[PDB]
Amino acid sequence: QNLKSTDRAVQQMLDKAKREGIQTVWDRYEAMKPQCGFGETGLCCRHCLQGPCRINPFGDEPKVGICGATAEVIVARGLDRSIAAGAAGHSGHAKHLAHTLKKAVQGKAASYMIKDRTKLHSIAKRLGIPTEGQKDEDIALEVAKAALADFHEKDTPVLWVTTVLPPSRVKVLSAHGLIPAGIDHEIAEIMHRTSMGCDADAQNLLLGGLRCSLADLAGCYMGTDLADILFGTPAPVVTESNLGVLKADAVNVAVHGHNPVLSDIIVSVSKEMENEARAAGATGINVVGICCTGNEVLMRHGIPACTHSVSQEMAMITGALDAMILDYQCIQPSVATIAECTGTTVITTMEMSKITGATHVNFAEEAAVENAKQILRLAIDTFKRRKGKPVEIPNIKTKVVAGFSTEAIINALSKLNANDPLKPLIDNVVNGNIRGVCLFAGCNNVKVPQDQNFTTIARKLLKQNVLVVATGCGAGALMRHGFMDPANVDELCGDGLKAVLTAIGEANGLGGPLPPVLHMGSCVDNSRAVALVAALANRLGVDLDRLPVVASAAEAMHEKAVAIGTWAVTIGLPTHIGVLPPITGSLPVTQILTSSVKDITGGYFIVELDPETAADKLLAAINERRAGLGLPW
Amino acid sequence: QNLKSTDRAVQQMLDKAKREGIQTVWDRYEAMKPQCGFGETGLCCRHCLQGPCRINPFGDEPKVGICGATAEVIVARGLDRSIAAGAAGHSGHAKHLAHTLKKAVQGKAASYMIKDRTKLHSIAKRLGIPTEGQKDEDIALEVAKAALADFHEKDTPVLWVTTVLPPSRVKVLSAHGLIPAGIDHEIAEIMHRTSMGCDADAQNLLLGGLRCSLADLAGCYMGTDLADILFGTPAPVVTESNLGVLKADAVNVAVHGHNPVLSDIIVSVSKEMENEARAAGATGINVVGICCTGNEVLMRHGIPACTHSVSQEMAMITGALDAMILDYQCIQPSVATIAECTGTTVITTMEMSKITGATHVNFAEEAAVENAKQILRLAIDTFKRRKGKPVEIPNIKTKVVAGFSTEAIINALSKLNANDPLKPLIDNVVNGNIRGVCLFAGCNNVKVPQDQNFTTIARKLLKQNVLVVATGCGAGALMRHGFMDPANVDELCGDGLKAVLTAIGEANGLGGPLPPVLHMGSCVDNSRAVALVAALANRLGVDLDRLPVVASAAEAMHEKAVAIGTWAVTIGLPTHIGVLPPITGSLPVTQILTSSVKDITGGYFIVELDPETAADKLLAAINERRAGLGLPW
Ligand code: SF4
Ligand code: SF4
Numbered sequence A, B: 001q002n003l004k005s006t007d008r009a010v011q012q013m014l015d016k017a018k019r020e021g022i023q024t025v026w027d028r029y030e031a032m033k034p035q036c037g038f039g040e041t042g043l044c045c046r047h048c049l050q051g052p053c054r055i056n057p058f059g060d061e062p063k064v065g066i067c068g069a070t071a072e073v074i075v076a077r078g079l080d081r082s083i084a085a086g087a088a089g090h091s092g093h094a095k096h097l098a099h100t101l102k103k104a105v106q107g108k109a110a111s112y113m114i115k116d117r118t119k120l121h122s123i124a125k126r127l128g129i130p131t132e133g134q135k136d137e138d139i140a141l142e143v144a145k146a147a148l149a150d151f152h153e154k155d156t157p158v159l160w161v162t163t164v165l166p167p168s169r170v171k172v173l174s175a176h177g178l179i180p181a182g183i184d185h186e187i188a189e190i191m192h193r194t195s196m197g198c199d200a201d202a203q204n205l206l207l208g209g210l211r212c213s214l215a216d217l218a219g220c221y222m223g224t225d226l227a228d229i230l231f232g233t234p235a236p237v238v239t240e241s242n243l244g245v246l247k248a249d250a251v252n253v254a255v256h257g258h259n260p261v262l263s264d265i266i267v268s269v270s271k272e273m274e275n276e277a278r279a280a281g282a283t284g285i286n287v288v289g290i291c292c293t294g295n296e297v298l299m300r301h302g303i304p305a306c307t308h309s310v311s312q313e314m315a316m317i318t319g320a321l322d323a324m325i326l327d328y329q330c331i332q333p334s335v336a337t338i339a340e341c342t343g344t345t346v347i348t349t350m351e352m353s354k355i356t357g358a359t360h361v362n363f364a365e366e367a368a369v370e371n372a373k374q375i376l377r378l379a380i381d382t383f384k385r386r387k388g389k390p391v392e393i394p395n396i397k398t399k400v401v402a403g404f405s406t407e408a409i410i411n412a413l414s415k416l417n418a419n420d421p422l423k424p425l426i427d428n429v430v431n432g433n434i435r436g437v438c439l440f441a442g443c444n445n446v447k448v449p450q451d452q453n454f455t456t457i458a459r460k461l462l463k464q465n466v467l468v469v470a471t472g473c474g475a476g477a478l479m480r481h482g483f484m485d486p487a488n489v490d491e492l493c494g495d496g497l498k499a500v501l502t503a504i505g506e507a508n509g510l511g512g513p514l515p516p517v518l519h520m521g522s523c524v525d526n527s528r529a530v531a532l533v534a535a536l537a538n539r540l541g542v543d544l545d546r547l548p549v550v551a552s553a554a555e556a557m558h559e560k561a562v563a564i565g566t567w568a569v570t571i572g573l574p575t576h577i578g579v580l581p582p583i584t585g586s587l588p589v590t591q592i593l594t595s596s597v598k599d600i601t602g603g604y605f606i607v608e609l610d611p612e613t614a615a616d617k618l619l620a621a622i623n624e625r626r627a628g629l630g631l632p633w
């Protein structure tokens, strides 16, 4: 089972699923082998009913699509649609939060409110919305209106791009026509230009993809901004991760998906139904996180993380998961059939994300508390149905220190330099105690033994004094293997990084270091890493493509992860991807994405499936940036 | 060659391409055989990097996608994305025209203007925009603003849906949540909900697809409305079609694509450069149409149609096509390589639709006349380069009567009843002289011998007294085979239909009938057929799903054609498709789309590849509707 997952709790549940005959994502993967090589290389097109068209990577015909589309065009069009789909998910999430904020301050949903006034006012200021002499509810109404306005064309470009990057970067992007005009506008223009008989030039297509990836960035940053207003900006928190955070004698409720508009309420309501849970025989209601929605409530409330991404079914296999409360994105639809076997109540809540066989509860912000109670009462009923049934919760968990929003990181650094908080970080980059920064992002992928790339790469970088930050299921992988536990700094970190983590920790009252890896939150919270890197750029007076900062989507899966990787390139970062995107069937497209895009944005993809080799390539990229700054390396 | 195309001019050019070694769309099709059956049946998914996933239609594993996605989900998600892509093309076209209109009346593009004031005021009235006491430029600015507003959420739904269908139909659709909130909003929500780990219920997914198809309808109707304001509403016109409209001694310039914002200007400018063309040795500039842009200028100006859709390369093979001026959509990218062999100058004009190897001219409304002159001067230079070269223009053309906008049809009928113009049509439906109405729409498809389904089905319906209207490359197929020539009424039409065509024609001064088939314009001008059918419904006080009206996308290809077929179903029509959409791998999805959707919208798909059988099925659907109205059949 260690070929399937490096997580020992997952291995234990894989054994249980095997002897119980429950098919898993790994079993469905094995049944899919050998996979189609045309699709794997990108040399397949179904964009019209003359298809499917495929192209042999090598050999004889077919060499060209039926309409004349070359390999270059087919690969670029498929890639562009994946970016647009990712942008559609992150920005649909943000759009939902924008409507929630508007409702809240219009008096239409009293379960929601402005919790972070400071964040609200700074966002308003960033956008040029006046605050002086204004009601908070009116400032927020203006912010929500501005958020919704960025989805369409207007007299300004997308402000959640142009106001969040340095002016020099906006200038570079504008010169190449890469600033989005509107988030949904760009998504639609991608779908148009990639449809049959439209755009048929690889460079033109890919420039469109870069622009659409910035629409994805805008959606991420908008989602983080709005969630922080509504639910609070994260600060350091201590909790735990992995299946051992389940409790046989509690009602175990997983929140799973992405948008916490529901699950932040589930958290608060669950606390108030403790006595109702005790009346039914439980100790209380044990809310645990899966995937991004779990990251959101981990960051804000210290809710323990149960599992992530590829191993999500395994939480159900314990037999102790009484309910799984779903919104959207990254939910394996198998959970609805597995629930028949495990007893778990799977509940969908969003109109546009239903799963056949799951119970649907039509969540409305107007009714959030009542919806939560309905849902948790199904969870309580399910807990009662498993009175006397044995469960198998692996007794495996790690300690997790998390909550490192960019505001929190700045505050932590400010204890070393109150009026120039980024300077202590830059000082230690300059003197080599910090070699660079690496952001781990994205999913697990059934093709890669779960977590193996994240942990292999992170271990090598940490020993080379790289400051590692993480989001999404990259953070999930790292937390479940101990990388967010400060007790592991001695083992994992080079001496210079240890010195810095310790200096910052001891200045924040901890008597111990910061953890080896800084958890910056959910996938939309990749925007937080952008805020940090942009602030560093501004403090240094350089653009992001001169900073020793890289990104790694080491086990990427979702179209959202392709979008994030693409905007990391577009904003200037060397960006590793540890799974093959469907591009190897076109050398010209591969060359654009890994090489000549450097001349456009200064970033570039590093495609590398071997994680030891990927780490060396990422270190080389960091060190090239150090050399460009005149720094030792 | 008659297995490839039923058009004799196309057959002749296929022989020429064969002996010259020029590969065609039919050759690239042959090289693609056998095509992938997983894609053909819809049982393939590449929506994440764990894929590709396929499902065997029958037999053993793989039976399910790696994430758990069933055949039903995979097929519905692929279909939904095709609808969104079609919606993105028709509404990108409309959006462009909306910006052009705004520019025109803001004084920013004097080559454009309000040409149809009557149309402008009636659209304003339909939308609830005040006209009394307003400048035309201000009415138009408001109409353009309303058009752009329908692309995003706002306090009203999409007005180019809710103001163009009968209130009873809007009520049925609203009750099922099918009215779009915004055109690009729905496109993005499709891409979101079909991404990995989101919507996974076939019925829910397909309801989303129906709503997105109405976003496509809105884009079509907006495009027709705005083009009529800017360029004039079509009225009856006489011209010709097929390759014989090329002239060896003229500069032959094809306008090809969809959006006529450029090609309407090309037409007017070409007339003024006649003397410059004569100075270079030509008789003049001969502008001819390909695909929809050609339909647009055929309808408004009587520009002859050269060819359509699958046979577009054949215009170049004559050797006489001096330039091909492209905007976007349905342009085989092969034309850019074929041009090397044929001498043709292929010119792209739109930023988001480029073709490697073609010359690009960056058209701007602000500069339309100057751009046109630059483009036509390249065409003149190319004409000069072929001094003394033999050309092979097949001497094959048909006479075409076209221009039957809905306003024109109403005006024609009004000569039989001035104050109740629809009543003569309804009278003849009631007494059986008109059995029903059939709209032929959509593309040619290399899988079907070109035009064979359109002409086979049309011949059977016309003999059964069906009033046949046509758009797009369906109109192209019918015009090239003589179905728009009134001289063929005796041969083609049943006696009752002949009587009606003759009565209307003789009342309009013609001394002859209307043509056998009424050309209602381009693909967005399928919206004109909706206006006609909606007006009939309103006059009868019934919904569209009680009218004896059907649609046939008899040789469909483009994602746009899937979108149109889907909104024809959604607004209440029995809708034939003569090529397999990728749905046969899921019987549940097939059953929804061909049967249980009747219970939602009253329309339904008729999937039938045999055209004689399709005609019988369409007649049965028409006759069932007649029976529901209590009419003989
Ligand atoms: S768009 Fe071109 S390459 Fe794609 S399926 Fe259609 S014919 Fe084939
Ligand atoms: S979304 Fe599911 S079915 Fe599609 S490729 Fe990914 S794992 Fe396979």
Ligand code: FES
Residues within 6 Å of the ligand: A036, A037, A038, A039, A040, A044, A045, A052, A054, B036, B039, B044, B046, B052
């Ligand atoms: S041929 Fe397998 S992905 Fe299309």
Ligand code: FES
Residues within 6 Å of the ligand: A036, A039, A044, A046, A052, B036, B037, B038, B039, B040, B044, B045, B052, B054
């Ligand atoms: S397996 Fe051929 S279309 Fe994917």
